[PDB]
Design an enzyme around this catalytic site. Structure first.
Site, short mmCIF file in Angstrom:
data_model
loop_
_atom_site.label_atom_id
_atom_site.label_comp_id
_atom_site.label_asym_id
_atom_site.label_seq_id
_atom_site.Cartn_x
_atom_site.Cartn_y
_atom_site.Cartn_z
N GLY A 36 32.60 -38.44 -0.95
CA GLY A 36 33.51 -39.20 -0.12
C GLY A 36 32.82 -39.78 1.13
N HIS A 78 30.44 -48.77 -6.33
CA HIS A 78 30.98 -47.77 -7.24
C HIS A 78 32.35 -47.29 -6.79
CE1 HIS A 78 28.69 -44.80 -4.59
NE2 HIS A 78 29.87 -44.24 -4.65
N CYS A 101 30.27 -41.64 0.93
CA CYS A 101 29.80 -42.94 0.48
C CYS A 101 30.31 -44.03 1.42
CB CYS A 101 30.25 -43.21 -0.95
SG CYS A 101 29.91 -41.83 -2.09
O1 LIG Z 1 26.42 -37.88 -1.05
C1 LIG Z 1 27.21 -37.82 -1.96
C2 LIG Z 1 28.00 -38.98 -2.49
C3 LIG Z 1 28.59 -38.46 -3.82
C4 LIG Z 1 27.66 -38.89 -4.92
O2 LIG Z 1 26.47 -38.67 -4.86
N1 LIG Z 1 28.20 -39.62 -5.93
C5 LIG Z 1 29.58 -39.76 -6.31
C6 LIG Z 1 30.22 -38.74 -7.00
C7 LIG Z 1 31.51 -38.94 -7.48
C8 LIG Z 1 32.16 -40.16 -7.30
C9 LIG Z 1 33.52 -40.44 -7.83
C10 LIG Z 1 33.76 -41.68 -8.46
N2 LIG Z 1 34.99 -41.99 -8.95
C11 LIG Z 1 36.06 -41.11 -8.87
O3 LIG Z 1 37.17 -41.38 -9.32
N3 LIG Z 1 35.81 -39.89 -8.27
C12 LIG Z 1 34.60 -39.48 -7.75
O4 LIG Z 1 34.55 -38.38 -7.21
C13 LIG Z 1 31.48 -41.17 -6.63
C14 LIG Z 1 30.19 -40.98 -6.16
C15 LIG Z 1 27.29 -40.39 -6.75
C16 LIG Z 1 26.78 -39.82 -7.90
C17 LIG Z 1 25.91 -40.55 -8.69
C18 LIG Z 1 25.63 -41.87 -8.40
C19 LIG Z 1 26.20 -42.44 -7.29
CL1 LIG Z 1 25.81 -44.10 -6.88
C20 LIG Z 1 27.02 -41.71 -6.45
C21 LIG Z 1 28.47 -36.95 -3.73
C22 LIG Z 1 29.04 -35.97 -4.53
C23 LIG Z 1 28.75 -34.64 -4.25
C24 LIG Z 1 27.93 -34.31 -3.18
C25 LIG Z 1 27.37 -35.28 -2.37
C26 LIG Z 1 27.67 -36.61 -2.66
NA NA Z 2 27.08 -48.06 -5.55
#
Ligand SMILES: O=C1C[C@@H](C(=O)N(c2ccc(-c3c[nH]c(=O)[nH]c3=O)cc2)c2cccc(Cl)c2)c2ccccc21
Ligand code: NA
Ligand SMILES: O=C1C[C@@H](C(=O)N(c2ccc(-c3c[nH]c(=O)[nH]c3=O)cc2)c2cccc(Cl)c2)c2ccccc21
Ligand code: NA
Ligand code: NA
Ligand code: NA
EC number: 3.4.19.12
Lengths: 305, 305
Positions: A143, A41, A145
């Site tokens: 971030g 992602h 990730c």
């Molecule tokens: O522990 C975590 C990781 C993170 C989290 O969960 N997810 C996540 C949220 C936002 C983005 C994002 C993608 N593209 C952009 O351009 N900007 C962004 O910001 C990517 C992943 C996420 C959400 C749903 C599905 C998946 Cl596979 C990943 C996150 C956000 C907040 C707090 C903790 C966490």
């Molecule tokens: Na992914």
């Protein structure tokens, strides 16, 4: 003496962490040999996360759209491929700091260290268990990730976890290093049920043995039990059923303490039924289940890497 | 989300650990620039530990009696000097892996990461506080001597602790990197009183703020209190008295949560007086005091090194 939630020394993993960017946000990747591994992602905008068609999104990207940086050293991407929920970015330079390593898919109830990173830089390290329901109770922000979970044995880093997602319930979900989720999760911004979770019985017992080794002995009682009797109690309190395999794994600790496994079970039974009556064990007022039998022996015998 | 006892990434310290031997047992040392730092009791036999005359014992030793090894690389010792309870062994080679670093004497109630080592090799990492009574509750076996405690800020490792001794009570005592014990301890095998200890009030409050940030909010009540009122309760429950300096240090967390410090004090008051009634906070059934206000912000905002 003493007993702490000890992580593995993180240095060997620190040398593998990079930053990966592919049009929007930056996440972490893991550079081993001439491959960078990261969550797929990385190719998604915020809007894409709702219902990504990863194949279609990836088709729009080329090698040169992946910016990979190791500290201040740009890496040149010469191929990319998606494997399940991870991307493998081939780079033209083998990481000189690559440790001896394996990829492992761990079992629920096993433990590992997490090197929490942001922008390819390490923030901190802690020890986690894989819950029976295949979530982890970590500490992760946006971030993080691409941060990985690992064990070290002798010189060899066994990578078992890559962080992908925080579920709406505030627990964490991720993959093995071949991109297969632990548990039923998918990489999209949806509400997703985790199983009912349970307490890892064999680990609680291990930790009771650790307590005895460390001099905390007040919970040892004059009772014993059977696997069958104990498992009735385990059922009532949402503990995993104990098997002979678990008893065998506890043999070393039983030998070290002179306390038969079923005798320790009877101690556990009494704690489950009566609580701790405002006492503590190893500085905890609850029954701790994030230490394996291996973990206890490792710490109580001072094994190094 | 989530909140764990997170240690600093240990890599920069791992590259400084060596083994030091001086006639009997081996312990760890810390190689920075062209100096190796280790506990002075490396020169003592088991019998010597009862009542060592360190000056006399050291006089019998020469440069060539100190065997220092960095992995499989022997270092050549070209001078030695005792400073308080540490030895400084001058070696002919500057450690190429020396990080930016400082030596710091920390305050009671501050936290640090410990890199537990044996035979100059890292075993594990965990986060510790310096208790008000200048002990630490670590996890150490024989041979862990010379393991260090540290913080990292930006690129800079602040060494604050070197491990020396386990007291007969099973808690740990050590020095700063100039060899001065924390607390009243001496390096000999005697029973030695540690102060009466207390709970680090400002840290408990920090951890209550962490809980609120993480969504654990059940303990927030409709009461407030005063510093004076709260400090009566603190006294009764063997908590450190809270000062305006502590309130000031808590300002950022108060601002982030919108919960006034004295309002959180009133929550703490109620928890101290009524207990937790079988509930948990951040996965703990007791009030946790090993996270500083800095620690909470560091973890809840994802700062890296
Ligand atoms: O522990 C975590 C990781 C993170 C989290 O969960 N997810 C996540 C949220 C936002 C983005 C994002 C993608 N593209 C952009 O351009 N900007 C962004 O910001 C990517 C992943 C996420 C959400 C749903 C599905 C998946 Cl596979 C990943 C996150 C956000 C907040 C707090 C903790 C966490
Ligand atoms: Na992914
Ligand atoms: O956390 C620790 C460290 C260690 C501990 O406490 N002390 C310790 C015990 C034995 C030796 C020793 C000296 N010379 C030899 O030839 N062989 C030996 O084995 C050295 C230090 C110690 C004891 C009293 C005073 C001081 Cl300054 C150090 C130890 C032993 C058992 C468990 C934990 C620990
Ligand atoms: Na977990
Ligand atoms: Na000493
Ligand atoms: Na401590």
């Amino acid at each position: 003496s003493g007993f702490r939630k000890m992580a593995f020394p993180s240095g060997k993993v620190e040398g593998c962490m990079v930053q990966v960017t592919c049009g929007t946000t930056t996440l972490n990747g893991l550079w081993l040999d001439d491959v960078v591994y990261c969550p797929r992602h990385v190719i998604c905008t915020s809007e894409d996360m709702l219902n990504p068609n990863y194949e279609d999104l990836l088709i729009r990207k080329s090698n040169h759209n992946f910016l990979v940086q190791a500290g201040n050293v740009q890496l040149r991407v010469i191929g990319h491929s998606m494997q399940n929920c991870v991307l493998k970015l081939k780079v033209d330079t083998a990481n000189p700091k690559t440790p001896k390593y394996k990829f492992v898919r761990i079992q629920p109830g096993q433990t590992f260290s997490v090197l929490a990173c942001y922008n390819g830089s390490p923030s901190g390290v802690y020890q986690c268990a894989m819950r029976p329901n295949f979530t982890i109770k970590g500490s992760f922000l946006n971030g993080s990730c691409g941060s990985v979970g690992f064990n070290i044995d002798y010189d060899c880093v066994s990578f078992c976890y890559m962080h992908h997602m925080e579920l709406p319930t505030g627990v964490h979900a991720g993959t093995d290093l071949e991109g297969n989720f632990y548990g039923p999760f998918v990489d999209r911004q949806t509400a997703q049920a985790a199983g009912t979770d349970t307490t890892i019985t064999v680990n609680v017992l291990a930790w009771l043995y650790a307590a005895v080794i460390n001099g905390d002995r007040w919970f040892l009682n004059r009772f014993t039990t059977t696997l069958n009797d104990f498992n009735l109690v385990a059922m009532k309190y949402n503990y995993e059923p104990l098997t002979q395999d678990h008893v065998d794994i506890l043999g070393p600790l039983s030998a070290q303490t002179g306390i038969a496994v079923l005798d320790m079970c009877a101690s556990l039974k009494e704690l489950l039924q009566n609580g701790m009556n405002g006492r503590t064990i190893l500085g905890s007022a609850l029954l701790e289940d994030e230490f394996t039998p291996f973990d206890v022996v490792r710490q109580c015998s001072g094994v190094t890497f």
